[PDB]
């Protein structure tokens, strides 16, 4: 069963998640309406293409880590 959807403003940016050249993912995350590629590992942890090597427990945590990494920068589509 996929994680729940979410929607919040984090550090001034809108992050959203929802169940659904890259993999076929069961879950989508967006930062200011631009899709953030994210991936689930076997142990249930999550990563994203802006923080691929540092697993975090949830897709919201991956979206927040991405906002932290981006330092205000617009995300580009994958």
């Amino acid at each position: 069963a996929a994680p729940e959807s979410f929607d919040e403003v984090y550090k001034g940016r809108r992050i959203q998640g929802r169940p659904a050249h890259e993999h076929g993912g069961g879950y989508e995350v967006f930062v200011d309406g631009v899709q953030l590629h994210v991936m689930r590992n076997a142990d249930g942890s999550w990563i994203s293409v802006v923080s691929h090597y540092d697993p975090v427990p949830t897709p919201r945590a991956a979206a927040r880590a991405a906002v932290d990494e981006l330092q205000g920068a617009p995300l580009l589509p994958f």
Binding site: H37, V49, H52
Partner: protein, 278 residues
């Protein structure tokens, strides 16, 4: 071809390595290595097809990828080979690795931008083109997101693991490959990506030239593991869905198998590699 510890390069070797890397960038060839790596990092998955990482072929795949890259360097300057970074030894921001004559140092605090060395955005010589966000400058935050690089004792603990890999042959595996990759255990390779920060912590990590030196050391640790365990070899050995078996060919090349890459000496040697002993 001898791959040398970065800490030992002469000022002449550093200059020639830097120039060859910048020429691959200038000609457009460099960015295509970044693009290839990004495709595999984003596509490999624990429950599906996996080739470049989170899988037994993590090590032979990166061995061939590094050979591709080194051959491209040698097409610019035949004297250049990939150096390796022993992050267990050269573990501080003050290592000569990070000096302005080699890779330049950490990023400034405001935006992570690398401000010195040959790859600093201000040179005009290192545009970040293959990227996941608007920023077009090399970034680093050495020791930002994680306190310390792996230590020698931690590396030795992983080297002591006898099994190359184990089912389910992914990020949940026990065994040497996944402990060296880092998804389980004290964490070697993934933690180094995190420690450098900037693009090295992302899905477009070869944007930082340190990527090659990091992976050349991971590749040396595979060769050290083999010396420690001459009775151990690549697994699986046939018939495994979604996983590259020993004699199966690997994307993107299609024409090489893990089996063809187990003996590095067919392609290069190290400045020093300890013999098997008890």
């Amino acid at each position: 071809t001898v791959r040398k510890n970065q800490a030992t390069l002469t000022a002449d070797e550093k200059r020639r390595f830097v120039a060859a890397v910048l020429e691959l960038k200038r000609s457009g060839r460099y960015d295509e290595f970044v693009r290839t790596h990004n495709e595999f990092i984003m596509s490999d998955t624990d429950s599906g097809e996996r080739t470049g990482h989170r899988s037994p072929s993590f090590l032979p795949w990166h061995r061939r990828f590094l050979l591709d890259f080194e051959q491209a360097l040698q097409s610019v300057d035949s004297s250049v080979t990939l150096p390796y970074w022993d992050w267990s030894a050269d573990r501080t921001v003050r290592a000569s690795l990070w000096a302005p004559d080699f890779l330049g140092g950490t990023g400034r605090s405001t935006d992570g931008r690398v401000m010195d060395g040959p790859f600093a955005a201000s040179t005009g010589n290192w545009p970040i083109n293959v990227r996941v966000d608007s920023r077009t400058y090399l970034r680093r935050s050495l020791g930002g997101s994680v306190a310390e690089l792996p230590t020698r004792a931690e590396v030795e603990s992983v080297l002591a693991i006898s099994a190359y890999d184990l089912p389910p042959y992914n990020s949940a595996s026990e065994g040497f490959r996944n402990h060296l990759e880092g998804w389980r255990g004290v964490n070697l390779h993934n933690r180094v990506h995190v420690w450098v920060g900037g693009q090295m912590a992302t899905g477009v990590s070869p944007n930082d030239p340190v990527f090659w030196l990091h992976h050349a050391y991971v590749d040396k640790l595979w060769a050290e593991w083999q010396r420690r365990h001459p009775d151990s070899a690549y697994v699986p050995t046939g018939g495994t869905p979604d996983v590259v078996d020993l004699n199966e060919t690997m994307k993107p090349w299609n024409t090489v198998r893990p089996a063809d890459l187990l003996d590095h000496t067919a392609y290069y040697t190290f400045d020093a590699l300890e013999h098997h002993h008890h």
